[PDB]
Amino acid sequence: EIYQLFEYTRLGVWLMCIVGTFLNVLVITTILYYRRKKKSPSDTYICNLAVADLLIVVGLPFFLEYAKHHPSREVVCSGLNACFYICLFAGVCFLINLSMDRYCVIVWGVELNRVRNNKRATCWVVIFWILAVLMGMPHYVFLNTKVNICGYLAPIALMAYTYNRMVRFIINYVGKWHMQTLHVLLVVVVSFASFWFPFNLALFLESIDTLQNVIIFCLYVGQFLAYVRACLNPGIYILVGTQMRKDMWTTL
Amino acid sequence: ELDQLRQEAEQLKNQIRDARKACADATLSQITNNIDPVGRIQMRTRRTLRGHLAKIYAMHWGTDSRLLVSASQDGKLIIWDSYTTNKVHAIPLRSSWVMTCAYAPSGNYVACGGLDNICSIYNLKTREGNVRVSRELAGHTGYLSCCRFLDDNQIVTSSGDTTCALWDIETGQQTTTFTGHTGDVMSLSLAPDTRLFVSGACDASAKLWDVREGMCRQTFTGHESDINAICFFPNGNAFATGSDDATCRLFDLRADQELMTYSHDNIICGITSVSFSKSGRLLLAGYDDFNCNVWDALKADRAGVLAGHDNRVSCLGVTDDGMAVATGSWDSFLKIWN
Amino acid sequence: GCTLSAEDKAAVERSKMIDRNLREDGEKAAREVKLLLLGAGESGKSTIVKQMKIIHEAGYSEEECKQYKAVVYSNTIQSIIAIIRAMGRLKIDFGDSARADDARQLFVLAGAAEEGFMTAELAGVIKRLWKDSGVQACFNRSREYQLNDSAAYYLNDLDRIAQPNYIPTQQDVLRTRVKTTGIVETHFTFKDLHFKMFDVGGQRSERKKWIHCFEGVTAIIFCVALSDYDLVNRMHESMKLFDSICNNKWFTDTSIILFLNKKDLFEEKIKKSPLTICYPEYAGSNTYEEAAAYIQCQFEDLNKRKDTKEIYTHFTCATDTKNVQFVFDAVTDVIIKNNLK
Amino acid sequence: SIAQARKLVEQLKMEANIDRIKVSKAAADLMAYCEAHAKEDPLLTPVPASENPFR
Amino acid sequence: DVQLVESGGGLVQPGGSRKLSCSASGFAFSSFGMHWVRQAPEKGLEWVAYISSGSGTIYYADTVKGRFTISRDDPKNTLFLQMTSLRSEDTAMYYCVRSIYYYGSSPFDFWGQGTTLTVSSSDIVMTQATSSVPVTPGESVSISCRSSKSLLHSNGNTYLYWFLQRPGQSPQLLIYRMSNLASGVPDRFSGSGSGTAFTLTISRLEAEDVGVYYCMQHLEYPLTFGAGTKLEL
Ligand SMILES: Nc1nc2c(ncn2[C@@H]2O[C@H](COP(=O)(O)OP(=O)(O)O)[C@@H](O)[C@H]2O)c(=O)[nH]1
């Protein structure tokens, strides 16, 4: 007895699925059709993040619609929770990896060449996938607080330090290449933290009648926001970069 | 006439070869067949000094076994403190094409040279607090290959014009020149007591020189190509060479012959550097296939591999107290093994 | 850290400052363009180096010719003594008569080597022998001895250069040959960008022992002469060097540019000796542009995998200062267009 | 093409007029020197971490 | 040669302000860290302030924190000290000292001259048994300086420094880290001792070596001096 009211009133859930498969396929095509964009390693992380967002969107409508058609408890909840948590962990991990890659690029030097760096990192990426799958074991008041802490505080810290370092290097190098990229990454991570924040606050304070109604409403809108956000997350990539749009159109 | 001189040189070559062969009753392998093997040598990586931005061509240990110098093609000399991985000095050069470097046994000076046919000497301890050029030595007609301090006032250099020389740092003129040689001198190694040295060239021969007179005493022709690396044994009665035919060799001064050949199959790349341990039991050699092998100096068996570089290993040195080994490579990293 | 002492923190911060300065200096010079010259002897590398310095940096002041007076004097006396040795080298008799005794006397006098100023008697004897028909014919008779190609210029202006009140000019300093040991480099600012070009001449040693030091340079310029197609031939050796340079495993990704110097000399001498001496397989007519195209065709076919890389060719005359500027503009345009990153 | 050839013959006599010892004696001296200094070689026998400056 | 020339100072009404400058010439100024060291008309020396190279670390003494300010101007090779709210206990003579820190360096090696300022109308304790020890030329003497906390660090170094001030001159470095002899110092001076007990030994004492000897510790900030021992004939 959750998410039913939106699911029951059958309106625009197909639009989220369409715009999310469109986003995922666009990003995947752009990354995968240009020789992995010079075999950059950060593109691998972005691709895995896309594979995660696509996983999430594919999971969320489909299972609920199946329950609509096939009329549960341990299973439907197991599937939903698993999907949500795994996607969350995957996104967090890939974001952290991207953060690190940029930070190392700025502080250190990429002038020295790297041979089969992607090949070495690929195992690390799988390691991350296994860790994400493991982390979701209980659900696949402790759980709620743990996610609320290690799913909100870590990005907001891993980005504030990176943003602090990023600003200083502008004064040091006066470079144009790192300006646009560091601003896009700053705005995306700021948006992701601001957006996700309230839902995890609600889930936290709920675990810690009016209580039931407020919690129900909060998780309801929360879930709805997370759904809609998963569909349109690649949108920031095109507004600032534009490179992806041109590449995708040319490939088609 | 000329032809009679050619026959005289042929008879002398036959006489020397026969006199060497006549005193080779037993081999080193048969005598040392009963020694126990060393076992397995496993060395881990202790440091990963990362401050160069181009290929590294040379390095040298300080005589106090703590400081070292490295030279690279971006135009910098960097002095490192290996205990804390700090940088002590960074010296810009007037020419970016540098192939060698050396460290004074007292710690006061540093030498450098390369494609400009000039050896530059830098003073490390001055009142102003910065490194400045003390002297520039000119007179070679080819690129500079190697250089080694004999003292705080004397230095020996070799060059690609088939000559070696002994310098007087106060006075800008050569004091002794070594000219009997035919190929290109590529490497050089000083004896512990600093009265003799050996040189290896690309005519597949090595020569033993005497510093006080400057005459050649013995010549060894055993390889089949260019010789790229050379080092003297710590006892002072033998030395080892490393060449482009994927083979190291050990030569003995007192018997004036060859003792052993260290080759293994599947290896088809050249050797860039060679060095001994303190007791003369392990021989360390760097290859072009990105690894570095450690050889049992008395038994031709291979006793391990050091496999932590991504490009060809170009320089390699062992400290005076023998606590660590440092290797450099073209991927712009230095590693300390122990 | 907490275990660090009072002095060690100062060491760490000094290391940090050294790292920052090193990084700044490294990335400052990581955006420049590095050219490299190669070729054979007397191809004309130093000529284009001097031309580059003249054009893209500044001119030469009047005081430079003061010290270049000695080297131009040495060049012209070496040229004339080579000529007077060559006239008797083949034992070719000439209508010298009294000029034969004059030549013997001045051959004796050539050991003066004052390098300050020629004797008026020496200049007069050189002038009067220069009008002799026999030595003039011998000057163009046999293209066998190693004669400098600037002798036709230096010995045609003796009425000005030999005077004590003589100073060289830009043309005089341009056609001045000297063999200096060591690497020569020159850096200049052009097209809002820094250029560095080298000249590995005088490294009389094995080239394969140090060629790997120049891995990954921005461009390589090859200088091949054309007027030396019947000099002891040399063009075959130039090709036997070109196939080794082009097929190198180190210069896989580097645009190769060809310069064909001495085009005016080729134009002058093509009407006398046919091209069949160098290439026996040639069968076309003795005309300029077809011969040049033939040289291009049989000089390009030594490149394997022509799909991956293509060589860029021009017909320059490095003595002429006008025609080097336009060619360098074209080559810098193409190297900028090929480096869009 | 005459001075180098004349010069090489005296050099060959000087390199052909030295006293030579047996290979066995030099081999026994190398093996004895290698055996004597075995205890002072850290790379042959790794030392405990209490006196390793790099651990 | 290395030179540091001072200027400024004068009679000041209490509660006012002033600024002292220290101009260097003869060495690479921007690669050194600078210290300000103060003395007293009759008392010993006391460390005041320290500025690093690149101006990335600043320390002040415990009694002048929040009133004094140190700065440097690298292109003009100048060092500045801005002094506000001058109390009557600041009447002293100020010195400008250079020091550089790496493996094997010798800090506090050049002191230069002073300037006279007349404002009138957890720390380690070092004790140096301050008294006059009479001497005669030819014999040998010893000087003691005991500490309160052990000066031996875990990396093997022990941070103790010895200085000599001849009458009416500037102080001179003699021994750093208890054994190393400074450049240009005769080999007649020896230093030894264990933790918390140190000795300086002079053998075959010559002339012109009369004056006051000070012992200093460099283990941790703020740096602390000793009372100073006097040698007189
Ligand atoms: N007349 C004429 N002479 C040229 C031309 N290019 C080069 N040279 C001659 O080349 C000589 C210089 O050769 P150099 O550059 O030193 O030979 P490299 O060192 O092998 O490149 C000068 O004496 C010029 O006379 C040209 O276009 N015309």
Q: C115 near C142, Cβ under 8 Å?
A: no
Alpha-carbon distances, residue E43 vs A59, C82, C254, E132, E228 (angstroms): 82, 89, 74, 15, 9
- Site of tokens 């030994």: E201
Among candidate residues B318, B330, B331, B263, the one with its CA nearest the CA of residue B65: B318
Annotate A183-212 with three-state secondary structure. Answer: HHHHHHHHHHHHHHHHHHHHHHHHHCCHHH
**Amino acid, single-letter form, for residue C65:** C
- The pair phi, psi for residue A169, each rounded to 5°, is -65, -25
DSSP state of B36: P
DSSP E212: E
Q: How far is the CA of A150 from the centre of ligand 1 (A)?
A: 74
Q: Is A225 exposed, middle or buried (0-12, 13-18, 19+ CB in 10 A)?
A: middle
Q: Contact A132/A93 with Cβ under 8 angstroms?
A: yes
Give the number of residues written for chain A: 252
Dist. CA E64–CA E92, nearest whole Å: 14
SS3 B33: helix
- B229/D contact by beta carbon, under 8 A: no
Q: What token pair was written down for C274?
A: 């046919």
State the Cα–Cα distance between residues C4 and B323, nearest whole angstrom.
24
The closest of B300, B294, B243, B249 to B272, measured between CA atoms, is B243
Give the domain-ending residue among E82, E117, E152.
E117
Question: Could you give the C-alpha distances from E170 to E4, E24, E47, E61, E97, in angstroms and in order?
Answer: 12, 16, 15, 22, 11
Q: How far apart are CA B289 and CA B267, in angstroms?
A: 8
Q: How far is CA A229 from CA A10, A58, A153, B137, C42, in A?
A: 19, 14, 20, 71, 71
Report yes or no: B326 and B275 within 8 Å, Cβ to Cβ.
no
Rounded to 5°, the CA angle C139-C145-C148 comes to 70
Structure-token pair, residue C16? 């940090």
Which of helix, strand or coil describes residue B315? strand
Phi, psi of A198 (to 5 degrees): -55, -40
CA–CA distances in Å: residue E150 to residues A154, C10, C273, E217: 43, 22, 95, 11
Beta strand B176-178 with B163-168: parallel, antiparallel or unpaired?
A: antiparallel
Strand partners, C199: C37, C184
CB A182 within 8 A of CB A107: no
The phi, psi pair for E110, rounded to 5°, reads -120, 135
Q: Give the domain ranges of chain D.
A: 1-55
Report CA-CA distances (Å) from B334 to B71, B96, B310, C271, E146: 11, 20, 12, 63, 44
Strand partners, E132: E230
DSSP E110: B
Q: Which residues pair with B189 in a beta bridge?
A: B198
Strand pairing partners for B178? Answer: B164
Cβ atoms of E216 and E223 closer than 8 Å: yes
Q: Which tokens belong to C8?
A: 């060690």
How far is it, in rounded angstroms, from Cα E37 to Cα E216? 12
Q: Per the omega criterion (within 30 degrees of 0), is the bond before E222 cis?
A: yes
* Secondary structure element (H or E) that encloses residue C288, with its range: helix C288-300
Residue A156 DSSP SS3: helix
Q: Report the structure determination method.
A: cryo-EM
User: Which tokens go with E169?
Assistant: 């001159």
3-state SS class at B204? coil
Which of E63, E98, E117 is where one domain is finished?
A: E117
Q: Which residues on adjacent β-strands are paired with residue B102?
A: B111
∠ CA A165-A167-A169, nearest 5°, is 75
Q: Residue C110 CB: number of other CB atoms within 10 A?
A: 14
Which one, of B100, B104, B91, lies nearest residue B118 by Cα? B100
Burial profile B276-312: b = 16 or more Cβ within 10 angstroms, e = fewer? bbbbbbbbbbbbbbbbbbbbbbbbeeebbebebbbbb
| Phi-psi map region of C89: left, alpha, beta (phi>0 left; psi -120 to 50 alpha) | alpha
- Chain A positions in Cβ-Cβ contact with residue C30 (cut-off 8 Å): 111
Q: Do chains A and D touch (3 or more CB pairs under 8 A)?
A: no
Question: Helix, strand or coil for residue E193?
Answer: strand
Round to whole Å and give the CA distance between C30 and C32. Answer: 6
CATH class of B2-337: mainly beta
Between the CA atoms of C136, C137, C138 and C142, what dihedral angle is there, to the nearest 10 degrees?
140
- Torsion, CA B330, CA B336, CA C3, CA C7, rounded to 10: -60
d(CA C218, CA C335): 8
Coil, strand or helix at C80:
helix
- The rounded Cα C141 to chain-centroid distance in angstroms is 25
User: CB-based contacts of E40: which residues, under 8 Å, 6+ apart?
Assistant: E46, E91, E92
Helices (H) and strands (E) in chain B, counts: 2, 28
Using an 8 Å CB-CB cutoff, list chain B residues near D7.
180
Nearest-atom index, ligand 1, CA of C153: 1
Q: What are the structure tokens assigned to C282, written together?
A: 């040639």
Relative to beta strand C255-261, strand B86-92 is unpaired
Instruction: Give the CATH number, domain containing residue C111.
Output: 1.10.400.10
- What's the CA gap between E91 and E225, in Å, rounded? 19
Q: How far apart are CA A119 and CA E133, in angstroms?
A: 76
Closest by CA to B335, choosing from B101, B85, B102, B71, is B85
For residue C78, the enclosing domain spans 62-174
Chain B interface includes D39 (CB < 8 A): no
Q: How far apart are CA E225 and CA E39, in angstroms?
A: 11
Determine the Cα–Cα distance for residues E80 and A109; give it in Å rounded to an integer. Answer: 37
DSSP B199: E
Burial of E35 (0-12, 13-18, 19+ CB in 10 A): buried
Q: How far is CA A59 from CA A19, A55, A95, E39, in A?
A: 15, 6, 21, 78
H-helix or E-strand containing E222? none
Q: Which of A111, A172, A173 is facing C30, going by the closest CB pair?
A: A111
DSSP-derived secondary structure letter, C156: T
Q: Which residues in chain C are contacts of A173 at CB distance < 8 A?
A: 27
Largest Cα span, chain E: 52
In the sheet with B302-306, reading across from the earlier edge strand, the strands are B271-276, B282-287, B292-296, B302-306
Single-letter residue type at C57: E
C-alpha triplet E14, E19, E21: angle, nearest 5°: 145
* Residues 6 or more apart whose Cβ sits within 8 Å of residue E39: E45, E46, E92, E93, E94, E95, E114
Inspect the interface and report whether the beta carbons of D21 and B279 lie closer than 8 Å. Answer: no
Q: How far apart are CA A149 and CA A156, in angstroms?
A: 11
Contact A142, A208 (CB under 8 A): no
- Phi and psi (nearest 5°) for B21? -70, -30
CB atoms A115 and B310 under 8 Å: yes
- Tokens encoding B311: 């490009």
Which residues of C does the annotation mark as catalytic?
A: 42, 47, 177, 199, 203
> CA neighbours within 13 Å on the CB side: how many for C244?
11
Q: How far apart are CA C58 and CA A126, in angstroms?
A: 61
Cα gap A146→A152, rounded to integer Å: 10
β-strand pairing of B67-72 with B56-61: antiparallel
Q: Which range marks the domain in which residue E61 is found?
A: 3-117
Closest CA to B124 of E102, E17, C263: E102
Helix axes A13-32 and A210-232, enclosed angle (nearest 10): 40
Task: Match 């250029």 to its residue by tokens.
Answer: C195
Is C321 assigned a ligand-binding role in the annotation? no
CB B158 within 8 A of CB B119: no
Q: How many Å apart are CA C261 and CA C18, to the nearest integer?
A: 47
Please indicate, yes or no, whether residues E7 and E105 belong to a single structural domain of this protein: yes
Q: What is the rounded distance in angstroms from the CA atom of residue B82 to the CA atom of residue B78?
A: 12
> What is the rounded CA–CA span in Å between residue B151 and residue E4?
36
φ/ψ (deg, to 5) at A184: -65, -45
CB of C3 less than 8 A from some CB of E? yes
| Whole-Å CA distances, A171 to A110, A165, A175 | 20, 11, 9
Residue whose C-alpha is closest to residue C175's, from C320, C67, C58, C324? C320
Nearest to A55 by CA among A97, A12, A24, A18: A24
A44 touches A125 (CB < 8 A): yes
Judge whether C243 is annotated as a binding position: no
Neighbors of chain A with 3 or more C-beta pairs under 8 Å: B, C
CA E10 – ligand 1 centroid, Å: 74
D46 CB contacts (<8 Å, ≥6 apart)?
none
By the 8 A CB rule, do E18 and E9 touch? yes
Amino acid making up residue E71:
S
Count of domains observed in chain E: 2
The domain that holds E144 is classified in CATH as 2.60.40.10
Closest by Cα among E229, E206, E35, E22 to E132: E229
Query: Closest Cα to residue E74, out of E107, E57, E94, E51?
Result: E51
Helix axes A41-69, A74-107, angle to 10 degrees: 170
CA distances from E145 to A176, E38, E133 (A): 60, 21, 14
Rounded Cα gap, residues E70 and E37, in angstroms: 12
What tokens were used for B26?
A: 């037993």
Q: Nearest CA to C251 among C217, C302, C213? A: C217
Same domain, E224 and E199: yes
Contact assessment for residue B277 and residue D43, using Cβ atoms and an 8 Å cutoff: yes
Query: Could you give the CA distance from residue E191 to residue B274 in angstroms, rounded to a whole number?
Result: 43
Give which of A117, A128, A115 is closest to A86, Cα–Cα. Answer: A128
Cα–Cα distance between C199 and C184 in angstroms, integer?
A: 5
The token pair at A184 is 């896009």
Q: Which residues line ligand 1 (CB under 6 A)?
A: C 41-47, 149-150, 175, 177, 201, 261-262, 264-265, 317-319
Q: D44, E139, C284: which is closest to B35 by C-alpha? A: D44
Show the tokens assigned to B66.
């703590």
CA dist list (Å): E129 to B247, E158, E165, E179, E215: 70, 21, 17, 21, 11
Separate counts of helices (H) and strands (E) for chain C: 13, 6
The two three-digit tokens of residue B213, written as one number: 């007179």
**Distance (Å) of CA A182 to CA A41, A162, A171, E119:** 17, 9, 14, 55
Query: Do E26 and E69 fall within a single domain?
Result: yes
Pick from A33, D37, C278, A43: which is nearest to B322 by CA?
D37
What distance, in Å, lies between the first and last C-alpha atoms of chain E?
Answer: 34
- Contact (CB, 8 A) for B292 and B285: yes
Question: What Å distances lie between residue B225 and B249, B292, C251, C304, CA to CA?
Answer: 13, 21, 25, 29
Amino acid sitting at position D21: I
* Of A92, A104, A157, A84, the residue nearest A128 (C-alpha): A92
- Nearest-5° Cα angle at A25, A23 to A27: 65
Interior angle at CA A80, CA A77 and CA A84, nearest 5: 135
**CB distance E107 to E183 below 8 Å:** no
**Nearest C-alpha neighbor of A37 from the set A241, A187, A252, A247:** A247
Token readout for C327 is 């060619």
CA-closest candidate to residue C304, choices C217, C216, C244 = C244
DSSP annotation of C44:
S
Pairing assessment for the beta strands E180-181 and E189-194 based on DSSP bridges: unpaired
CA distance C147 to C80: 10
Q: Which two tokens stand for residue E51?
A: 């500025």
Instruction: Report how far ligand 1's centroid is from the alpha carbon of A166 (Å).
Output: 54
Helices (H), chain A: 4-8, 13-32, 35-39, 41-69, 74-107, 117-135, 142-150, 153-173, 177-207, 210-232, 235-240, 243-251
Check if the beta carbon of residue B76 is closer than 8 Å to that of residue B52: yes
Q: At E58, is the secondary structure helix, strand, or coil?
A: strand
Distance, C-alpha C125 to centroid of its chain = 32
Structure tokens at D8: 């090489």
For residues C319 and C262, give the distance between their C-alpha atoms in angstroms, rounded to a whole number: 8
Smallest CA separation from ligand 1 atom 7, residue = C44
Both tokens assigned to B329: 């490579």
